[PDB]
Design an enzyme around this catalytic site. Structure first.
Site, PDB file in Angstrom:
ATOM      1  N   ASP A   6       0.430  -6.515 -19.540  1.00 23.36           N
ATOM      2  CA  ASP A   6       1.070  -7.265 -20.780  1.00 23.36           C
ATOM      3  C   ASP A   6      -0.012  -7.158 -21.732  1.00 23.36           C
ATOM      4  O   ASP A   6       0.439  -7.338 -22.961  1.00 23.36           O
ATOM      5  CB  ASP A   6       1.768  -8.472 -20.454  1.00 23.36           C
ATOM      6  CG  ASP A   6       2.817  -8.451 -19.329  1.00 23.36           C
ATOM      7  OD1 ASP A   6       3.915  -8.110 -20.110  1.00 23.36           O
ATOM      8  OD2 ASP A   6       2.912  -8.455 -18.246  1.00 23.36           O
TER       9      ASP A   6
ATOM     10  N   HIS B  88       3.768 -14.774 -15.919  1.00 26.16           N
ATOM     11  CA  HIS B  88       3.996 -13.369 -16.057  1.00 26.16           C
ATOM     12  C   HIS B  88       5.357 -13.604 -16.235  1.00 26.16           C
ATOM     13  O   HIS B  88       6.194 -13.437 -14.919  1.00 26.16           O
ATOM     14  CB  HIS B  88       3.332 -12.739 -14.817  1.00 26.16           C
ATOM     15  CG  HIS B  88       3.456 -11.180 -14.973  1.00 26.16           C
ATOM     16  ND1 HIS B  88       3.983 -10.376 -14.018  1.00 26.16           N
ATOM     17  CD2 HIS B  88       3.272 -10.631 -16.251  1.00 26.16           C
ATOM     18  CE1 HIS B  88       3.795  -9.322 -14.632  1.00 26.16           C
ATOM     19  NE2 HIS B  88       3.351  -9.099 -15.795  1.00 26.16           N
TER      20      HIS B  88
ATOM     21  N   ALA C 299       0.965  -1.186  -0.142  1.00 23.74           N
ATOM     22  CA  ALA C 299      -0.002  -0.057  -0.181  1.00 23.74           C
ATOM     23  C   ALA C 299       0.931   1.064   0.020  1.00 23.74           C
ATOM     24  O   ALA C 299       0.512   2.352  -0.224  1.00 23.74           O
ATOM     25  CB  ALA C 299      -1.018   0.022   1.270  1.00 23.74           C
TER      26      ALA C 299
ATOM     27  N   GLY D  87       2.196  -9.019  -6.817  1.00 21.93           N
ATOM     28  CA  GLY D  87       3.680  -9.336  -6.389  1.00 21.93           C
ATOM     29  C   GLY D  87       4.177 -10.640  -6.980  1.00 21.93           C
ATOM     30  O   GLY D  87       3.662 -11.664  -6.854  1.00 21.93           O
TER      31      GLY D  87
HETATM   32 ZN    ZN Z   1       2.648 -10.929 -12.604  1.00 25.46          ZN
HETATM   33 ZN    ZN Z   2       4.842  -7.515 -17.007  1.00 20.40          ZN
END
Ligand code: ZN
Ligand code: ZN
Ligand code: ZN
Ligand code: ZN
Ligand code: ZN
Ligand code: ZN
Ligand code: ZN
Ligand code: ZN
Ligand code: ZN
Lengths: 360, 351
Positions: free
Chosen positions: B167, B195, B20, B138
């Protein structure tokens, strides 16, 4: 094609959307702009039926960073942001803009007297003023955020005689929003129950948080908050030290909330003011009924039909405690004004301004 | 649980945000508060979680919020304890994660962060709403999400997401550019897999103004080799210009990710999101979090898209990413309940 960036080069106006509004933004590669540009692009500021164009002005030194911002905008896919352009020449970036958010300004440097800041940043605004007069829309709204706001705005409009003086603004909204928050907190009420909060004067330590005309749940703050000492000594200092308190806490600039205030400031001009309320904005004083000196930019209570313009609020009460603070701020502005006489074309400059007046 | 002036329309929805005090949050929180994410009729409450090391930064943001006067933001509170911040939360945006330390092997990151989401997964299970939607940012996202849901059995494995929307958005932009069309004329763009540098921008199923992309962009050489790379190196191209993180744009992608879940998906279109793959119809490994194309009725959940075609070019890439994920999974078995851990993961895969 030298007036468009990346994917934004592919658009053109698709004649229930309103005609595209052009917005220029100086200090475009800055922290405040980094938060503000995306709010604008999302339509939260001007509304879901208002497509826009963003003209970003940066500098040779920050042009790289400026490219980075444009690229992040490309990756945001905001459907209302139809156009984006970047540049370092205001005579180019400013053509045909309907709004000019002038955030760019040199920070107060080490051992830099108030006078030098007035001259250095004044010169910048004198030029931007000429650019706006030559290439921008004759009805452009100019919102000044670069310090020192009030005097920069006076200089800017004085260098743009072909643009109504009335169209120039020195933003005090952030301080209004903070004052309202402090008032709400003090009266143990939520901020949506506080109204008629005014910041008079210039954006500096002499600014005047007006509690006399403020209301909490429809009633005059003075009948809700009995602590007169707080109202006359703690309230103002609390407001005044908020920006500074956020510097050691956060560690740096409170960019997000000042971008929020810039957005509110704009919305206050493009949406009708709820009956009985008003908003603060440093504006040209000539014609004011508050007895304030003329030919300067002084924050005052205003309301708007939502046509992009405004009128000074008349249903205001004034007592000596407010009057004195208003005249003190007025004096600092008359001193700043004479100090930049060369830039306004007033004649010859004479500087004798206070040193510790910059709001932290 | 309140902060400053906050110590004083549809039913209120509670949102928890980790990391945060981070840069992404600094942009996201205000989008949430203004109502551009859940709408002007959805009052919210923000539960801000940060590390003790950043408590002061947490206060700063909370203070900026009080000063923003957002009328939809009815509650704001901060803390450093998940079992505290997560109570009754309907949404949990988990941005918090330790950055790739100095000379830190992929395996170290997995354990360190995986251990963080394992604990947050437990806190959510224990105190958060039973139908809490969890969006993970994260890194590693997929593996962190997997670890998180394995540690939250009383919460539908269905509700966990590893974000790839950034993306996808970047992919849509690169397709619009190459095709000389605006980004709002591009659709059905999918990011498959993990990812990372193994992610797969799917151009086979991509559309531009209603027609397959292969029907507009004739430069096949591009689609097959350049396209995926430009996307893969967009973050790097941004760090060289801007100078630092692209907080602003990813904050936008996160807002989009949420909106694809609470807004009816446009007919024939879909949005990318890493999710639980057990019931997957594409024949991809199960019991993991893989980014696949989804659509939703805008009620908070989703369903996979079946109107997808495949080929060997695509499927091969989907498998290499699948191989990386399985490797990451074994590497954190001690956090999923898969027994012992074995780490044989690639090093330079970070986007
Ligand atoms: Zn990711
Ligand atoms: Zn990325
Ligand atoms: Zn145009
Ligand atoms: Zn013109
Ligand atoms: Zn100012
Ligand atoms: Zn201020
Ligand atoms: Zn008194
Ligand atoms: Zn509690
Ligand atoms: Zn398993």
């Amino acid at each position: 094609r030298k007036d468009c960036f990346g994917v934004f080069c592919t658009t053109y106006d698709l004649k229930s959307w309103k005609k595209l509004v052009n917005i220029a933004v100086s200090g475009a590669a800055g922290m405040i702009s980094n938060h503000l540009l995306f709010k604008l692009a999302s339509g939260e500021v001007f509304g879901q039926d208002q497509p826009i164009a963003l003209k970003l002005l940066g500098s040779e030194r920050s042009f790289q960073a400026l490219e980075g911002v444009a690229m992040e905008l490309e990756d945001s896919l905001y459907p209302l942001l139809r156009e984006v352009s970047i540049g370092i020449d205001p005579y180019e970036v400013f053509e045909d803009v309907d709004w000019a958010l002038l955030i760019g300004a040199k920070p107060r440097g080490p051992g830099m007297e108030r006078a030098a800041l007035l001259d250095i940043n004044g010169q910048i605004f004198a030029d931007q003023g000429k650019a706006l007069n030559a290439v921008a829309s004759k009805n452009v709204k100019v919102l000044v955020v670069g310090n020192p706001c009030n005097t920069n705005a006076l200089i800017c409009l004085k260098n743009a005689p072909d643009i109504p003086a009335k169209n120039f603004h020195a933003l005090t909204r952030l301080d209004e929003n903070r004052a309202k928050c402090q008032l709400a907190l003090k009266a143990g009420v939520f901020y949506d129950k506080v109204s008629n909060v005014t910041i008079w004067g210039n954006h500096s330590t002499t600014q005047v948080p007006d509690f006399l005309n403020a209301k909490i749940d429809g009633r005059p703050v003075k009948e809700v908050i009995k602590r007169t000492k707080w109202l006359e000594e703690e309230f103002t200092i609390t407001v005044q030290k908020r920006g500074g308190a956020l510097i050691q806490k956060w560690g740096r600039s409170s960019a997000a909330s000042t971008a929020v205030s810039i957005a509110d400031a704009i919305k206050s001009l493009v949406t009708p003011t709820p009956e009985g309320d008003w908003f603060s904005t440093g504006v040209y004083t000539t014609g004011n009924p508050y007895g304030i000196a003329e030919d300067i930019v002084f924050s005052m209570p205003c309301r708007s039909k939502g046509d992009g313009d405004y009128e000074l609020a008349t249903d205001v009460s004034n007592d000596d405690f407010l009057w004195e603070r208003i005249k003190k701020s007025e004096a600092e502005l008359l001193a700043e004004k004479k100090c930049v006489a060369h830039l306004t074309g007033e004649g010859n400059a004479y500087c004798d301004v206070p040193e510790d007046t910059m709001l932290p």
